[PDB]
Amino acid sequence: RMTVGKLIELLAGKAGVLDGRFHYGTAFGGSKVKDVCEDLVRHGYNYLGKDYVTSGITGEPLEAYIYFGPVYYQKLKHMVLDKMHARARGPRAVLTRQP
Amino acid sequence: PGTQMTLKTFHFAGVASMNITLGVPRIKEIINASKAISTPIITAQLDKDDDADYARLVKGRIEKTLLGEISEYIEEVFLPDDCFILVKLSLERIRLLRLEVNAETVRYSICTSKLRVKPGDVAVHGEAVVCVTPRENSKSSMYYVLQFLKEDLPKVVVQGIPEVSRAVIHIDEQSGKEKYKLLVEGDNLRAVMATHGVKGTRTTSNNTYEVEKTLGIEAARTTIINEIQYTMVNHGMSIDRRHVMLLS
Amino acid sequence: INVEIKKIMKANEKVTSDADPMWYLKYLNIYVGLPDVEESFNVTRPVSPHECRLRDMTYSAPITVDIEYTRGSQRIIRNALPIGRMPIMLRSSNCVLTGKTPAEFAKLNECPLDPGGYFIVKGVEKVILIQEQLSKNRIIVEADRKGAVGASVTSSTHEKKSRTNMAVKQGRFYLRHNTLSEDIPIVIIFKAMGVESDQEIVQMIGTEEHVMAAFGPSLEECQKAQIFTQMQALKYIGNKVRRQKTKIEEARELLASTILTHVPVKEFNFRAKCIYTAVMVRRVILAQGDNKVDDRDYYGNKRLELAGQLLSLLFEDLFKKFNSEMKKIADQVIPKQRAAQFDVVKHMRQDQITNGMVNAISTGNWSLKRFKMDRQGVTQVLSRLSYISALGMMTRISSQFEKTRKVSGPRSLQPSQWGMLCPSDTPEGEACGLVKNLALMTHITTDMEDGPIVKLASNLGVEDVNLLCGEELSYPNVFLVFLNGNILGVIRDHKKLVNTFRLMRRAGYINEFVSISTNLTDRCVYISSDGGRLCRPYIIVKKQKPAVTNKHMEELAQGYRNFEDFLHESLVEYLDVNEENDCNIALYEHTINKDTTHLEIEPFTLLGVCAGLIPYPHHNQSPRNTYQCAMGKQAMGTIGYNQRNRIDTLMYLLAYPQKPMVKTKTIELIEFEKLPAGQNATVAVMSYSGYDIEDALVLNKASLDRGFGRCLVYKNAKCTLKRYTNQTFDK
Amino acid sequence: MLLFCPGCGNGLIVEEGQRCHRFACNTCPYVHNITRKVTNRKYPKLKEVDDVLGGAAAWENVDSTAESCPKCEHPRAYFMQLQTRSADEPMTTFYKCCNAQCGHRWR
Amino acid sequence: ETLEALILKELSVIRDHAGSACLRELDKSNSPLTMALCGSKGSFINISQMIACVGQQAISGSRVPDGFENRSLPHFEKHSKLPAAKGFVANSFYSGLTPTEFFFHTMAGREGLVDTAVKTAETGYMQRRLVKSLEDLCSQYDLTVRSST
Amino acid sequence: DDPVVQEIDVYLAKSLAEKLYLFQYPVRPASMTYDDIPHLSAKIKPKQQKVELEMAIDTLNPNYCRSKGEQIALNVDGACADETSTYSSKLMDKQTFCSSQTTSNTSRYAAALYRQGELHLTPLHGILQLRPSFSYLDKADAKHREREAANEAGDSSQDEAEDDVKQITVRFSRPESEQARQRRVQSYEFLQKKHAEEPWVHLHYYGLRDSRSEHERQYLLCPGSSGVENTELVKSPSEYLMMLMPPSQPSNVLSMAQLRTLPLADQIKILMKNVKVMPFANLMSLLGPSIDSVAVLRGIQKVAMLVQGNWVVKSDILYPKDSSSPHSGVPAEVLCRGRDFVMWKFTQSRWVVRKEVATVTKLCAEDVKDFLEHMAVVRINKGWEFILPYDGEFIKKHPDVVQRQHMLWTGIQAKLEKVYNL
Amino acid sequence: LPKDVSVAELLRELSLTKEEELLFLQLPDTLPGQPPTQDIAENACTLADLTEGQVGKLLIRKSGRVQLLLGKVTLDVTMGTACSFLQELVSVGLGDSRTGEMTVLGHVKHKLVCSPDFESLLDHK
Amino acid sequence: ADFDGDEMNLHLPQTEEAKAEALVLMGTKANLVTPRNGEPLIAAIQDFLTGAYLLTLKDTFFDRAKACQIIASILVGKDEKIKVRLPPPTILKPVTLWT
Amino acid sequence: ENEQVSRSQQRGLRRVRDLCRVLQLPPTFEDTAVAYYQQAYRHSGIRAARLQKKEVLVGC
Ligand SMILES: [Mg+2]
Ligand SMILES: [Zn+2]
Ligand SMILES: [Zn+2]
């Protein structure tokens, strides 16, 4: 899908929550990558978002760094509780005796 | 595979022209078995596939050439004694295109489904001069029907098959030898096979109705199989030949 | 409700019956008043829109009118007589919500951030989508089914609409109309419209050799018949006239009024109509060569009808029906009832217009028999899934096609949508490409008076078309000037004309919404002044430097000036699609070159309302942006400050909504941060346990336990205890 | 050509009188005898294209040069990229390699 | 058409050379490159588009048609056949796309969407017809395929 | 680009203002003229100008077909009736040209006669386009219809006396409905009958070769001196532009153009309501140098107060007595008191603490924030600083205004100490 | 035939030859004047209200500029549509209520168009 | 499917013959290949191709504990009644590593 | 029924309808009024009357 914008938003949000600011994702503009990289390197974090992470299951560090960061996730109205359906014999239609 | 097909473009089959319907519309036209299809393609093999002169000769033989496409000027001259239309054939362009067309062939081309022009009306004066003198037919037609001739005189066929609209010289650049073939955008396979210099034994077509009517039902089945397989391969997806054989 | 309704009332101010003359009903002035509720016994009471939502009633205002009539030849005047109920759009001029403070909004149980602009009928919120249609009174050159390149013109006036076509099926031009039995040659119509000499016809068509060569067959076919005078041609047309010398009069009436209604004839003078059809034939001849076929998807030829024009047409139809019913009742009552003089006040049905408006707004189907218009899906239920959902549905635009065929032409994204409509915002599904959204910075123009435009055009040297023959139309330097499809005249050196018109519009003597464009291919200067056209503001650039400087922006920030001052001082001007087709616009200051006329204000204004929520959208793919807009239209979150008192059939709310950390300027503009529809979570992009194979995600149990993602679903259960005809009630 | 009567302006046709061929109108007794030769050429467009095509130099109007294919790993190739399917999340490739007259065509 | 083909060839040369340069300069253990090598998801073309350079936006197998008079957008000169003025995207997804390039990409995306929307219906109808016609055949025990009759 | 040469004068003549007509033939090129064609008559009407020329054409010329002439003459007229014949002889001899009216008003059109160093203009009374009319064919069709009627009547050699007495078919003069009456009035037949009601006037033709042409050609000139100052045509360009273009008839709704049309007091009030912070020099520049400074000062003293050399709009101006806080709903009097306290704190010290104001005024955070944003900016480690610097020039120039504002601020401070118990 | 210009037109009409020529210029709807004692109102002021004598001057500046000074304002004169059909300027004088005289004054060949210089009127005030 | 909110249907036969025919003819193990061209459709997918690729890389060298854990990660269900059959290590003299 | 409705009965019910409509009454009032009118019109002495009687009956 080539969603580099998601990575840029993650990096900007991480820099913002580190320095207490609100970065802008304005189309054809906004905060550049160099600014958020400098903000990350200033607070002592990695300039690429990837951080040293230890596996919780085995207790051993991972061979590759994990890309952590705050992302603005939104929940949709599509719920499994409202979409779950099961049909017994039940009623039928008057014209054609079908469910 | 119809859902798997993307209906792409730019698939000119290596000639960079002659846009042909391929994909789901092609499969639909094949399975509908319509008598007239969109953009029919006829592949003709040559006896002399190494010579380009023979290729252009047989191309001019099979391709329909109108009178206005070869004549350099057509003028309605009203002399004080009589009025007539003078057509000047461009012999230079004729020998450039290698068309076997002279004043006699042009005169024979006229008087054919053209308001019943009598043979005495058309005459030849020079080597490439044609004089047409129409007469009143009395069926609500007078001498000032000359203009009507000006509307359809250049649009008369002098050489080639009327059903053939466009024929091009395709070339194959195989490392062993570069051979020449004819790609005809027409709907007449029998005429193409009947022309001189065309190897009719290795002539195929895209229209299944023409193949059925000309070379039998088994040739039509084979053409359907080959065309469906080619259309399927064009999209990169493969189908077992047994399915298309059962369909045909 | 302030101007158009008064014009509609003035158009039907007097209504009278044929029987019993000297009797009439004269309307004086109509008022709409403030929204009220008829709950109280014969008493009106101010009602808030939220109360109308709760009580499942309509939010309308009583339309009254003052009149004068004759009962027994004694003129009786009425100063206040209610005649209907018009539903009041929220946040309008007469709405109770306008001119209110957020505290007063809280006192009325209404959200201050609510966009409004939607009607409330029977408790449901209906929104009238912006309708899109083709521009009227315009020649369209297009290919037919058999490949024949013909022309069409749909002449639509305030009364009748007629689409007449012209074809070249047999090398000659035949004119086809719905009022003719068989298509007739164009030369016969030329001879019937006053001009009888064939030389003048040929000069009007064109003096080019190919033009005469193409028009030859038509002249020959005309000379074949014995049609050489106006009387013979009119007799032939009348013989070809369908049933609805008498035939000659009917043919002349159809040629003068029915055919080309938009082209006006002073007194049976078809000179303008002759020039119009000659220009049409010339365009067809020029299009018969190089395939310069006009496209339907070009938005410069599109018109947007808002709710105002639709409501005006509906009110006009309802008022005409009411007047017809009143005249019928008068004719039935007055001549035989009694010496008791009949008066209209005893039969002024007040529920007719009210029920008509209520049904047309609720059901959404509009059937106008006076205009033969049968539309469906005009009004839609406002989606209250979230604030973004309603804010985006409020600026929706539907297509005229309405899924009649998968053409893929109008469904495609045309370059004409630049700055006008959002390119990425479109519903994913069967309605992809037919339902669109407006841009962030856009405006729809209204109708003008068109008087000073004609005056300035006449004073700018435009010679009258009646003064010269059609031969001047064939000159390469003579350019035709039009006006809303009507031939305004001819001109030479159109550059000076266009420059002077633009300078006069910038000065303020001409309305800033009047558009002017030039087509060098057809050599036509179009002057558009009708409503529904899309315009966009642009900074004027003169000699490689924009007119707007840092000092002007500092004054704007400090409050010395506003946008209207920028409009008046020739700094920012509105450009139409047809006008921007000829102008040169620069995206940025560094892109400004010598051949630049305007400057783009802001590029991110290209996106719409929903697409503005996308952080860094220029780094993502277009289907991703489309899916994001589609899901944001269905995103869960807070609706407004009055979401607790609001009782809807289905509502989704978030427990702990949080504003995004990466917010676009559009978010601050639409105040989305005050009503967020999501939460910021510490996401780690990695593969874990293989439970996120295809698009899935793994959630933390402790996070969900501590309140992350907690949601609330509010449903409504309504019951009614109504009294029947008999004296019994539900208990 | 198209001629018109100076008197009424209608189209002139060519007929034969009692002495010579003449132009005349059908709505007025105006006539005009032909003295010298009159001609109207049109100069129809001639076929200029030789209709020769398919050259290897003209066919190799593509970017693909010195790449590696999973069929015959020859340098000269011919790549085509397609993005016209939303159901297929990835893109679509079509590679041809006819350096040694192989003529491959795959996805 | 010759000029169009030459310009498309030059743009494709730029695209493929930038992609080769990006693939050569990228180091191993790179997650996009790793997922492209194993073929699980993505390819080298997507990597080159998102890192080095986006390719030429092709509508119906051709450059962006002139929506306005003799030009695609009013921001370019009339009768201008420059690459950036006809659909070329010089910048990549990482550096950010210009408004014109973003508009052309959205045009291509909407074209693909409507193409798939029409294709789905057409293939559904074709499949319905084919199954309704071919549902009668069956393989018998004598190795001969016979119809219902 | 100076007018180096060709300084031609323009004269006006009113001799042939009502007798000058423009005749143009759209079907006759300028090469061939009607000078040699002998004309016969011209029918014309004073009102509703529509001239019909009747000219004579030769016959012995080789460009005329005598057989077709005899045919068309026998078709249009009878055998030897000759009572009402479109042609005197048995050949087509007379030709009819009909005029069509281009436009109703021709005042903007004028004929220009150019002589050495002068150009004389003459108004046109009307412009008509002359085209060859086909009216003999209508009479020929009427003659054919009456001949067909005669042939139908003559089916028998001897026609008995028909008892076709005209029964009295007098139809009712029914009262026509207004719609049908308007349709009849707008009908083409009614207009044609109304045009025909006007009697015709016959005129003779005088060609260009006639001496009368050159005799009357001199009437386009006017006797006058070379240089004469015209009494009229002396209006300024602004008056001309007004003539050729006659008119049709948040708080920042009114633009600057609409503002300048308002009285000075209203202008100052609206500017102080919009900006709320501005110096005296900026106000003088915005209002214009043509306005006296004393009037502007007296106007601004009524709606503004002096704070650190700058002018700040009064509290009651922004918040009317019927308004309220949009954030808290408190009455406007409390907002005015809080804003006066903020302005007093700013006059006492340039730095103002938001927490101290919120504690003293007992107001919410949003009201204090709105009060401070109107006249202050946030400075880190310093609090809120006045947006404009100390303007000592206006203070030194107007000491009496400074003293009056000082005593007004003293009274305001007394009121604030009485209310908030400072 | 190349498209001529008004400056060169007047130059060849006066310098190259001395024969008089009949022109047909189109004046604007309202002239920059007031009807003198015509019983009014800011109505249209045409040539029918003005008197005889010198009413304006015709200036020919450099680079092909052709202006008409009709007082305080200056209009510009350009070439109109080049008509090729016959245009006969005649004088129809109805001296008597029963018989009148039609006097062929001359032929019209060129057409001029006079337009207000709106740019100067705008930059002036 | 792509697990993006798509709904799927689940039917339960009410006849033993129908159940047996469904299990035999429409068995998942018996329809691993499509009848179009015989290509197998039920195979590895994303996060399985990349995982197996990174596992079979030449850089991979696992000790006894990690290799035993990765092997036992599949010993569930019917694989609980079979021997592990730990393969011999490749390198053993410097360090005992399983590739 | 509803077909044996005299022209006078139709006029009376239409009068009831327009009378309850000009007062802007809910449809329940119209239903109750037309029901009462149809119930009162069952008498022989009521159906055989003048237009004044039917109009005042509609009013009542
Ligand atoms: Mg899915
Ligand atoms: Zn003639
Ligand atoms: Zn290879």
Side-chain angles (χ1 to χ4, degrees), chain D residues 69 72-74 97:
Chain D
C69 63
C72 52
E73 63 272 355
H74 283 62
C97 198

Side-chain angles (χ1 to χ4, degrees), chain H:
Chain H
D2 38 358
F3 296 141
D4 57 352
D6 295 357
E7 308 175 15
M8 299 192 65
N9 310 335
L10 177 140
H11 306 76
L12 178 61
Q14 309 296 286
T15 304
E16 301 291 340
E17 297 181 347
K19 170 183 178 181
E21 289 189 358
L23 186 56
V24 172
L25 302 180
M26 304 193 315
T28 307
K29 302 178 299 181
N31 298 327
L32 294 177
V33 294
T34 174
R36 178 179 59 181
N37 48 16
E39 297 178 354
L41 294 186
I42 298 92
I45 203 60
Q46 51 181 126
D47 290 71
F48 297 153
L49 294 170
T50 301
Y53 176 81
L54 293 175
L55 177 70
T56 59
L57 283 183
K58 200 174 300 180
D59 293 323
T60 54
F61 291 98
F62 310 139
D63 62 315
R64 184 164 60 93
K66 179 58 63 180
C68 289
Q69 180 68 17
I70 297 180
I71 291 180
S73 60
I74 70 180
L75 300 177
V76 291
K78 62 171 58 181
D79 299 330
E80 294 178 359
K81 304 298 182 300
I82 58 179
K83 195 177 180 60
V84 174
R85 189 194 174 274
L86 179 64
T90 299
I91 310 177
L92 49 88
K93 180 59 185 297
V95 282
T96 305
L97 300 179
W98 276 269
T99 175

Side-chain angles (χ1 to χ4, degrees), chain D residues 4-12 24-31, chain F residues 68 134 136:
Chain D
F4 303 91
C5 170
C8 61
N10 296 271
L12 295 180
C25 174
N26 301 330
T27 57
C28 62
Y30 174 83
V31 294
Chain F
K68 189 175 184 60
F134 299 90
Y136 56 91

Side-chain angles (χ1 to χ4, degrees), chain F residues 8 28 112 216 234-235 240, chain G residues 23 30 34 58 72 86 103:
Chain F
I8 311 177
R28 173 62 67 91
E216 199 170 340
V234 294
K235 291 193 174 184
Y240 191 23
Chain G
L23 301 180
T30 61
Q34 185 72 15
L58 202 160
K72 293 183 177 60
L86 181 57
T103 293

Side-chain angles (χ1 to χ4, degrees), chain B residues 85-97:
Chain B
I85 307 180
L86 190 147
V87 178
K88 182 67 66 61
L89 307 171
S90 60
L91 297 181
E92 187 71 20
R93 309 308 303 269
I94 287 299
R95 63 177 57 92
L96 178 60
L97 298 180

Side-chain angles (χ1 to χ4, degrees), chain D residues 67-77 96-100 102 104:
Chain D
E67 286 86 16
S68 60
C69 63
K71 303 303 177 182
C72 52
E73 63 272 355
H74 283 62
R76 200 265 291 182
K96 171 183 175 58
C97 198
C98 195
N99 185 84
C102 298
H104 289 91

